[PDB]
Design a protein around this ligand. Sequence first.
Ligand SMILES: O=C(O)c1cc2ccccc2o1
Ligand SMILES: [Cl-]
Length: 468
Amino acid sequence: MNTPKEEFQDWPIVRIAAHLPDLIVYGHFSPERPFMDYFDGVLMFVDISGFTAMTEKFSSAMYMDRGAEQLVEILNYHISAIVEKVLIFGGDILKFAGDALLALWRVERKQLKNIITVVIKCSLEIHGLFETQEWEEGLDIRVKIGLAAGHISMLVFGDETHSHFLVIGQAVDDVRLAQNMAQMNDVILSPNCWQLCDRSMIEIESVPDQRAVKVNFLKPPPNFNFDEFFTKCTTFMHYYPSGEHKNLLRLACTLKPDPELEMSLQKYVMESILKQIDNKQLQGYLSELRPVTIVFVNLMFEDQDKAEEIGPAIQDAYMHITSVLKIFQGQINKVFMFDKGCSFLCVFGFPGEKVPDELTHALECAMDIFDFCSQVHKIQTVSIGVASGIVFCGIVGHTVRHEYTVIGQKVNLAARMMMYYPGIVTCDSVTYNGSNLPAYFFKELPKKVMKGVADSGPLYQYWGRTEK
Ligand SMILES: O=C(O)c1cc2ccccc2o1
Ligand SMILES: [Cl-]
């Protein structure tokens, strides 16, 4: 009696699970929005910001008309190898957002110490991927790694058809700060990660004027076997692929059709991604160098680590942001913490979502969002950065773990505008000149040197219709 091999694993539910972490896939949580969870873990923040420079050169006539295709191919080539490293070492990739990825090892407090060792070793094997890596003309493209450990809160917000999630708290703030201290090839530990770590495993040096530390070496004791050590650590990793599924990168590759789970998971994913997953759109349609308008929205709180305080406020802002964006096919691409505030990366003019008068609409939407969010209880400061131009749109990461992302100088510009000009609506020259709006709607701003952007162009505050 025959026994045919290889289980079918290309279900729509599996394709949707690629765009999500295990934190979501295996989350099983209540309907209420906002939803909040509290746990401990180790965070890894890998920065690959050599490619926001690569985006510009891929726009040139060199690449003929295959710049977006060549860019996503070389990106994913490198990011796939980082993803595979994180996954094999037992991490959950939470999020991709142009310039970086965030990974989680969610673990009970007693196991934090040993898991930090696992995460450090993973970090050093990531750097070793790029030791003699390059693309000939210009540079060599390497990574920067910040690590943190401690209390982590999760926020889930949304409505009946859309869901978004965020990690929040001191370890989230710390991993971002650790990453900003890092140079090319560094592994930085947050002060608390250093306080919790196995100090007899790791050789560090002092970071100037900083409580955070730099890993120089992993020097394991005489009788230490990393493979045996890792095997002991997998005891505490709920979803580590094992036994008959030991060949898999993600347990999520084994998800079976489940209408109720799929209904809940599809809400995290953009309708155009779902269409491609459903084989109703060509799988290359979403990789594009495309003119868009970025509306970057930042919401500041008195304490950005207390999810019970800020979760209701983000939900309230989300509900209004979503109603305003739908009007013009605006999309929330990502939500995440900056080093100060919760930020919504909103996009006008994504593939098949182009409206006429994109710029006038992006500006009126920004002001609407600004005015509402300014009246939301616990929102201390709203800042909105508006920038317009050619950006890269595409699915970034590994086959088993990928996300739709925007990358480009105009993405970085909108982000830097909202941090360097807090409390106002700002826009670039493209938005200002190409707005179908009169000059007195705007105030021409002083020029600030912005860490990441070279000649921004003239910047403007969107003042709005009246003097008041
Ligand atoms: O460039 C950033 O600030 C950035 C990238 C990123 C990736 C995952 C989660 C948060 C993130 O923030
Ligand atoms: Cl996040």
